[PDB]
């Protein structure tokens, strides 16, 4: 739906970045296919097959741009945020550990 629903992790972050690059390459390659078909289509203007091929290619390109990538970007941003949240709770615990060690040391003196 809104996210690919992959649990936040450094592994997921790496996968999403590779997945995003793939989606962006597909968008550009299909856009070039559409542009090539559009030029030939306009030059002729076996005609209706070009009109269907352009609409089918543009529909796929539009979905990548409006559905699939936005979803990858939302997933990646979600992962990044959740990873920083996990980093924070580790910092908190370590800070208290350092303070408890200092307190223990003072008591021993």
């Amino acid at each position: 739906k809104d996210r690919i629903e992959i649990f936040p992790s450094r592994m997921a972050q790496t996968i999403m970045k590779a997945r995003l690059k793939g989606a962006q390459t597909g968008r550009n390659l299909l856009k070039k296919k559409s542009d090539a078909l559009t030029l030939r289509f306009r030059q002729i203007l076996s005609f209706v097959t070009l009109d269907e091929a352009i609409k089918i290619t543009n529909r796929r390109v539009n979905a990548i741009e409006h559905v699939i990538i936005p979803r990858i970007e939302r997933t990646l941003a979600y992962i990044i945020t959740e990873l920083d949240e996990r980093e924070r709770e580790e910092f908190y615990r370590l800070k208290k550990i350092q303070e408890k060690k200092k307190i223990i040391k003072e008591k021993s003196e």
């Binding site: 649990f7 979905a63 949240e85 709770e89």
Partner: protein
């Protein structure tokens, strides 16, 4: 018999000169005698969790050590009353202080000692009789709905030496005198039980009977049972409080214990105003709902420590009625607010946190809470049968079902009523996801359903398959644009919409959807599935012929059927009873069958 306050960090107070104090004993902190409970012992110093705001407490204030642990008073006078998080009645405070604010340090009896109760003995006991824990030796008529059984407390036994004759007695008198080994015990109508200890039962039994919910979804597809445990981890606006209130208003339980632990104050007032105006006929007589309900208010802006006492106080009350042979269906509208209290206290305690700042023992508290639910054989010679169900809300931040509380809860509860914020935004209420939800009691109730209905189970299965197929298609249709869909798939997609809009959602603030009797849910589902099968057959038998019945042909031919099917919700079961609804649904079935014969 006193200690002295050493320091205050908020809800946590440190006290000294308490060498003999034990864990989980009650104390009175300060000159206002604030209620608290000992958490830690460090030499002769005690760490006290205080259930009232600690502002104004000074170092050196006395602390009274009370030997009794946090406990609940159990007896007549509970039903119809509203309690705070530690069982101080709010109607008795407001009637005595004349204030609108709850004072701090209020010492009010949980159950009034002025009421003269109508008491009748069991008429089966005699002096010299041997009585054991859980035995019932009389009944008090609290009201016309609930008969309040006077039980011998657990961990007490002996020979009967005196039994009060029938008459008018209050909660300060002696009803039963029994002796064990020289030692004699005098009992009134009120017993005290530590709130953190589980009341003992003869046997925990499997749950084999539905917990009726006034909802189409949350019943037909994801049943709950008497004695079962469920969670509703809805995001804000998802309508999980409304689901809880609907279950409370319209269910087949005998007693409802509603716990508002961290809930908005306006919600508890809504119950107190609305419930008295509801009806439930008993034996030809109209009676109010409040006589069979009780509720606990510990609102969000009240002391955070009290959130733990509120949760345990509620379930302790639930067990009390369970022991008397009643089916109890308690619901705590928060859970996350309780776990939040545990986090805040753990912080003040400087404890080492676990996942996302929560205490490591979060799972331990939830596990022992939910396991107190269940259908049981009661202790006591009279052989009672009862249950406690728990329907607990959870409030995951952002609606992300990943927090320690939702995660731990899902590992405990057997019914998952997941809500989807994106359905609530569309006012698709109840906002049940129906893709991530599940119920592990389906197999348990299959016997019930076959005994009373039979037709329900194959309808339940077909409905789930249609909804799953729609999701499987929606994923790809978003990308294709409905270009490659077969005629059999277009029917699935449109019937699935029919189910979603007319069956799964209902407006709980209407005279017709406020309660959906089960026979109506299965009745209207049968018609919707019957349409599915007939419409799918119509195309399957014609697709390869010299004229295929595509959706556009059946849609134009049967448009009146599709509208009538959508109107099936608007039946008002209170104005139009069972006879008219069944006859009406039968008419739509006949209309469909006749239209198909003229179509194909």
């Amino acid at each position: 018999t006193f200690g002295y306050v050493h320091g205050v960090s908020g809800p946590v107070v440190t006290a000294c000169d308490m060498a003999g104090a034990a864990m989980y004993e009650l104390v009175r902190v300060g000159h206002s005698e604030l209620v608290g409970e000992i958490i830690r012992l460090e030499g002769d110093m005690a760490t006290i969790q205080v259930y009232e705001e600690t502002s104004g407490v000074s170092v050196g204030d006395p602390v009274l050590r009370t030997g009794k642990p946090l406990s609940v008073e159990l007896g007549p006078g509970i039903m119809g009353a509203i309690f705070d998080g530690i069982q101080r009645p709010l109607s008795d405070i407001s009637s005595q202080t004349q204030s609108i604010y709850i004072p701090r340090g209020v010492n009010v009896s949980a159950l009034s000692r002025d009421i003269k109760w109508e008491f009748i003995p069991s008429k089966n006991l005699r002096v010299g009789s041997h009585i054991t824990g859980g035995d019932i030796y009389g009944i008090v008529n609290e009201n016309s709905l609930i008969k309040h059984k006077i039980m011998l407390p657990p961990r007490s036994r002996g020979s009967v030496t005196y039994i009060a004759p029938p008459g008018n007695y209050d909660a300060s008198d002696v009803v039963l005198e029994l002796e064990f080994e020289g030692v004699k015990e005098k009992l009134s109508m009120v017993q005290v039980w530590p709130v953190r200890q589980v009341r003992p039962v003869t046997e925990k039994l499997p749950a084999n009977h539905p917990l009726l919910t006034g909802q189409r979804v949350l019943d037909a597809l994801f049943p709950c049972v008497q004695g079962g445990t469920t969670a509703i981890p809805g995001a804000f606006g998802c309508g999980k409080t409304v689901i809880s209130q609907s279950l409370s208003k319209y269910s087949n339980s005998d007693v409802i214990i509603y716990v508002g632990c961290g809930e908005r104050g306006n919600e508890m007032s809504e119950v107190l105003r609305d419930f008295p105006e509801l009806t439930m006929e008993v034996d030809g007589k109209v009676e109010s709902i409040m006589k069979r309900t009780a509720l606990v208010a510990n609102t969000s802006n009240m002391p955070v420590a009290a959130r733990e006492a509120s949760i345990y106080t509620g379930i302790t009350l639930s067990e009390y009625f369970r022991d008397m042979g009643y089916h109890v269906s308690m619901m705590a509208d928060s859970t996350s607010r309780w776990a939040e209290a545990l986090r805040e206290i753990s912080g003040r305690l400087a404890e080492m946190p676990a996942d996302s700042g929560y205490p490591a023992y979060l799972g331990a508290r939830l596990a022992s809470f939910y396991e107190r639910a269940g259908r049981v054989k009661c202790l006591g010679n009279p052989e009672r049968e009862g249950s406690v169900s728990i329907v607990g809300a959870v409030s995951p931040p952002g609606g992300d079902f990943s927090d320690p509380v939702t995660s731990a809860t899902l590992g405990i509860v057997q019914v998952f009523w997941g809500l989807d914020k994106k359905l609530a935004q569309r006012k698709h209420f109840p906002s049940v996801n129906w893709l991530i939800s599940y119920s592990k009691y389906m197999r348990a109730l299959d016997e019930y359903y076959d005994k009373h209905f039979t037709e329900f189970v194959p309808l339940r299965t077909k409905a789930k398959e249609i909804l799953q197929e729609e999701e499987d298609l929606a994923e790809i249709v978003q990308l294709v644009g409905k270009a490659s869909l077969a005629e059999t798939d277009k029917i699935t997609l449109e019937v699935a919409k029919l189910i979603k809009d007319d069956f799964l959602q209902q407006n709980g603030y209407t005279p017709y959807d406020r309660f959906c009797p089960f026979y109506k849910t299965v009745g209207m589902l049968s018609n919707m599935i019957s349409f599915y099968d007939m419409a799918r057959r119509a195309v399957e038998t014609t697709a390869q012929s010299d004229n295929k019945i595509t959706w556009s042909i059946i849609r134009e031919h049967m448009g009146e059927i599709l509208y009538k099917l959508s109107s099936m919700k608007f039946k008002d079961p209170v104005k139009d009873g069972e006879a008219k609804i069944k006859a009406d649904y039968a008419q739509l079935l006949e209309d469909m069958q006749n239209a198909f014969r003229s179509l194909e």
